[PDB]
Amino acid sequence: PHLRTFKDNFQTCKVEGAWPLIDNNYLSVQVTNVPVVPGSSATATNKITIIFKAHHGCTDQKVYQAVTDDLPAAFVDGTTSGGDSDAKSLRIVEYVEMHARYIGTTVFVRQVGRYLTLAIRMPEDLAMSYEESQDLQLCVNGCPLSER
């Protein structure tokens, strides 16, 4: 599909199957892309997985997953907020939106036709906070040259 990176480079990537958009110290964003028709280099998103990693005193680990024709307004455990009932540092509102205030991060997910779209707003210091081995992150470095 089309990708707009944190570095404002716009790319058209095939990236078929499961690919990490974000893989950092605070968040995991994983997508599944499918060829629009068999054998096509044009691909589109049928699954969006977001892992909000455990943040002591703010949220327990939460997982969001949307697929084509299934965009819930809750995490996989049926919760709509992280941690306790009083803890609103992490919440979901119906676009379905995820507000991770604790990491100044917003994630918007919607279904446009048969496929899914994604928009992520993240603070620069947190977006660039990742370990050496976390070098595959479509949002940071874009796609491998062979995928474009």
Binding site: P1, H2, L3, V112, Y115, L118, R121
Partner: peptide
């Protein structure tokens, strides 16, 4: 207290 500056944006869409 939990609450986190410049923002970076990422997008993925069709076609």
């Amino acid at each position: 207290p939990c609450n986190y500056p410049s923002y970076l944006f990422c997008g993925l869409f069709g076609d």
